[PDB]
Each structure stands twice: as C-alpha cells, then as structure tokens.
C-alpha cells in the first residue's frame, strides 16, 4: 500500500506553491511529465527539426542570425511566494 | 491501495497552488503532461518542422533573422502567490 | 481502491487554484493534457510544418525576419493568487 | 508498505516550495520527469535536429551566429520563497 | 517497510524548498529525474544532434560564432529563500 500525505493540517497564512505526483506500475517521446513549473523568459530556437533529406544535394545556403536591439527585463519574485513582505519594482 | 492527501484541514487564508497527478496502470509523442504551469515569455521559433524532404535538390536559400528593438517586459511576483503583502510596479 | 483528497475542509478565505488529475488504466500526439495552466505572452513562430516536399526543385527563397519596435508588457501577480493584499500598477 | 510524510502539521506562515515524487514498479525519451522547477533564461539554439542526412552531398553552407546588443535582466528573488522580507528592485 | 519524514511539525515561519524522491523497485535515455530545480542562464548551444550522415561528401562549411556585446545579469538571492532580511538590487 501507498499513502502519501503533504500538508495535512495548516492553521497559519502560507504562500504554498504544492506539487504531488505519484506512480505506480527522429523525436520520440512516451512517458513524461515535463514543465509542471516551467518559466522560459527569452527563449529562442532556430532551424529545430528541418525534417528527413533536407537540403539534400547541391545545397547553398546562407544562414545568418542576428541577436541584437535593446531590449529590457525586469522581474521580481520568479518563482518565489512570500508570506508577509513588501515586493517593490522601480 | 493508493491514498493520497494533500493540504486534508486549512484554517488560515493561504495563497495556495496544488498540482496533484496520480497515476496508476518526424514526432511522435505518445503519454505525456505538459506545462501545467508554463510561462512562456517572449519566446520565438523559426523553421520548426519543415516536413519531409525539403529544399531536396539545387536549393538557394538566405535566411536572416534580424532580432531587435526597444523591448520591454516588467512583472512583478511571477507564479509567486502571496498571502499578506504589497505588490507595486511603478 | 485509489483514494484522493484536496483542501478537504476549508475554514478561512484563501486564494487557491487546483489542478487535479487522477488517471487509471508530420506530427503524431495520442493521450495528452496540455496547458492546463499555461500563460503564452509574445509567443511567435514562422514556417511551421510547411507540409510533404515544400520547395522541393531548383527553390530560390529569400527569407527576412525582421522584429523590432516599440512594446511594452506590464504585467503583476501573473498565476499568483493573492488573499490580504495591495497590487498597483502605475 | 509505503509511506510519506512532508509537513504533517504546520502553525506559522512559511512561504514554501514542495516536490514530492514517489514512484513504485535521433532522439528517444521513456520516461522521465523534466523540469519540475525549471527556469530558462535567455536560453538559445541553432540548428538542433537538422534530421536524417542533411547537407548529403555538395553542401556549401556558411553558417555565421552573430550575438549582440544592449540587453538587461534585473530579477530579485528567483526560485527564493521569503517570509518575512523586504524585496525591492530600482 | 519504507518509511520517510520531512518537515514533520514546523511551529515558526521558515523559508523551506523541499525535494523528496521516494523509488522502489543517437540519444537514449530510458528513467530519470532532471533538473528538479534547474536555473540555467545565459546557456548558448550551437549545431546539437544534427542527425545521421550529415555533410557527408564534399562538404565545404564555414562556421563563425561570434559571441559579444554589452548584455548584464543582475540577480539576488538565487535559489536563495530567507526569512527575516532585506534585499535590495539598486
């Protein structure tokens, strides 16, 4: 038998973030769980999974990725719960 | 037997985030859970999956991925419950 | 027997979000739960799955992608329940 | 028999991050539990899973990744729970 | 008989992370855990799994990376929870 017990009792105030999980028993992929707390910020992907033979014969190609320009950001408690505080962004 | 318990008696005010799974028992993807909290910010993708046999024979390609300008994101308590606090931007 | 409690008795006034799943037992996805909570913000993509043999003889193509200008996101307690609290944006 | 205990009983207000996994029994993944607490940040890839036999025969290919610009990332607090704080950002 | 306790009465308000992991019993990989709290930042790849038999005869590739410009990450407290302080970013 399994028995799986997370914050059984709570009388205060808390910021709680609560992830349970419980098992019993060219991309491929059968079982998972990805991301059950995923924050990408700026994230970027080029030419993923172009597919079977590309550019397969005589290929000229020219690939050329400019990353650039002013760009800002700006974040305060990623990820993070707070009971009692003062969280401030200026 | 499986039994599973999570946050059984709350007295409080909690700012609270359960993520409870139980489970018993060119891509291909069979049995998943994906982003049952994702942020995704500002996140890009060029040329994904193009299929099967592209560009094949005699291809002339010029990709430029120009990236750039006065870009902002400001957030403040990002997947962040809070019970008893202040939050300001300014 | 499988057996599952969330937030069985609830006394006070807190800010929740409950996510419960219980399971018992080009592009190719069978059995999937996807973004039960997921928040896209400036998401792009460009050419995805152009299909079975795109530009497939003697292809002259000129690709530009050009991202700039001006933008703003503000944003505050994204996925952040929040009980006793002051949020301001200004 | 198995048996699991995190937090049975709580009386303050503790700002906290719970992960419980409790389990009993070109590219292939089984199974697998990714990025329960991931947090990407100007995370970036070029050319990944180009596919079976790309550039075969008499490929030119300049390939050329120009990175740059003024780019800012102010975060306080990542993956930091905090009870009793002040957090502030200017 | 397994039997594990974590945190099993908490009376003040502490800033707590918890990982329990409870088991009983091109690229390959059949069963594992990754990145349960994973913070990568400013995490560059170029040219990953181009697949099988890539450039394979009278290839003539020129591959330049450059990688400059003025970037800054600012950061406090990572991975980092407290209890009773102040943090500041100015």
């Known amino acids: 038998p ?3 017990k ?3 009792a709570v009388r205060g ?3 709680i973030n609560v992830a349970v999980h419980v ?3 060219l991309t491929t992929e059968e079982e998972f769980v990805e991301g059950i707390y995923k924050v990408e910020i700026d994230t970027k992907s080029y030419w993923k999974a172009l597919g079977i ?3 397969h014969e ?3 190609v020219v690939f050329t990725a400019n990353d650039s320009g002013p760009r800002r950001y ?3 408690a990623l990820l993070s ?3 009692y505080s003062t969280t401030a962004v200026t």
């Open 2 to 4: 399994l028995m799986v």
């Open 13 to 15: 105030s808390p910021a």
């Open 23 to 25: 098992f019993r028993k």
């Open 53 to 55: 033979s590309p550019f």
């Open 74 to 76: 700006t974040i305060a």
């Open 58 to 60: 005589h290929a000229e």
């Open 6 to 8: 997370v914050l059984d």
């Open 81 to 83: 719960p707070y009971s």
